[PDB]
Design a protein around this nucleic acid. Structure first.
Ligand SMILES: [Ca+2]
Ligand SMILES: [Ca+2]
Ligand SMILES: [Ca+2]
Lengths: 152, 152
DNA sequence: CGAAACTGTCTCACGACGTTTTGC
DNA sequence: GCAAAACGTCGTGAGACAGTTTCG
């Protein structure tokens, strides 16, 4: 439950609004009660020759990791608890991705809840829809509508 | 000669390191003495549906303008004086583009002497080589080397 | 089972120039 | 003659997912 310096949050919020992404996904997966996993991800993408900057975010944020994918790299943070702590503090300084950060926080708080009702889980999936709508979504497939394959 | 708020600068620096570009160019033009114009530009690019963010920047920075170019728009700041003032205050919070910022600042401060000595003009055209090397330059064509057509 | 990771890629939304036209 | 504006383009450097797997 680390407390972040405001100057750091202000700059990073700007950077996140730029090269960052706040993602919410519904991943079909049979091992789950509702045959889908609710996935949340905070990420920052950057050309690999500049990964030092992402590695630094790992150290500064105190959690997450950097993944290499060729000419580009990403700082990824998915652990729900640290993500909630982080987005809570980052959120007030965001200008382009604040709505989605808030939706993510809202989803996180409703996870245990939605993981018990086919309709509560479906409501949460509705939140995921909104986040995707707010992002420049171009290759999305699984939506709350598709999860509504739960009826039967 | 406007003084910007620190939290505004902190956020913007991060956003600039993300979607911005600090540019220096040598534009071949016959109307100039040394057949080239020293052009400097600070710009922030964004998908046109988010043009409001760029329009808002024009108000917050107090100078500059937004141009449209298809699916994308750009906030542009070229006026050398407000540019110098703006970058002077932003530069300390930059992390990926701090070097190019200080170089632009330096080019501006040396512009006057650059007009006289055809040799100082080439040394300034050096500063611009440096800036392009720092950016992810890939379509550049006019360098200090080409300027050396100042040999007759 | 389920939190989180490992792995790959579609379609841009940017970055970083260049070329031309003004205007004092 | 130089500053600032206009208008147009190369080649990504991002964003935003998808899909399958690890293992307490
Ligand atoms: Ca962006
Ligand atoms: Ca960037
Ligand atoms: Ca970007």
């Amino acid at each position: 439950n680390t407390k972040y310096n405001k100057e750091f949050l202000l700059y990073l919020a700007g950077f996140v609004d730029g090269d960052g992404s706040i993602i919410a996904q519904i991943k079909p997966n049979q091992s789950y009660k509702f045959k889908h996993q609710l996935s949340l991800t905070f990420q920052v993408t950057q050309k690999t020759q500049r990964r030092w900057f992402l590695d630094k975010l790992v150290d500064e944020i105190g959690v997450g990791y950097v993944r290499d994918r060729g000419s580009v790299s990403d700082y990824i943070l998915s652990e729900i608890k640290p993500l909630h702590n982080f987005l809570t503090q980052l959120q007030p300084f965001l200008k382009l991705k604040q709505k989605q950060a808030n939706l993510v926080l809202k989803i996180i708080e409703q996870l245990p809840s939605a993981k018990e009702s086919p309709d509560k889980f479906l409501e949460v999936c509705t939140w995921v829809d909104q986040i995707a709508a707010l992002n420049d979504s171009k290759t999305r497939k699984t939506t709350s509508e598709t999860v509504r394959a739960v009826l039967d």
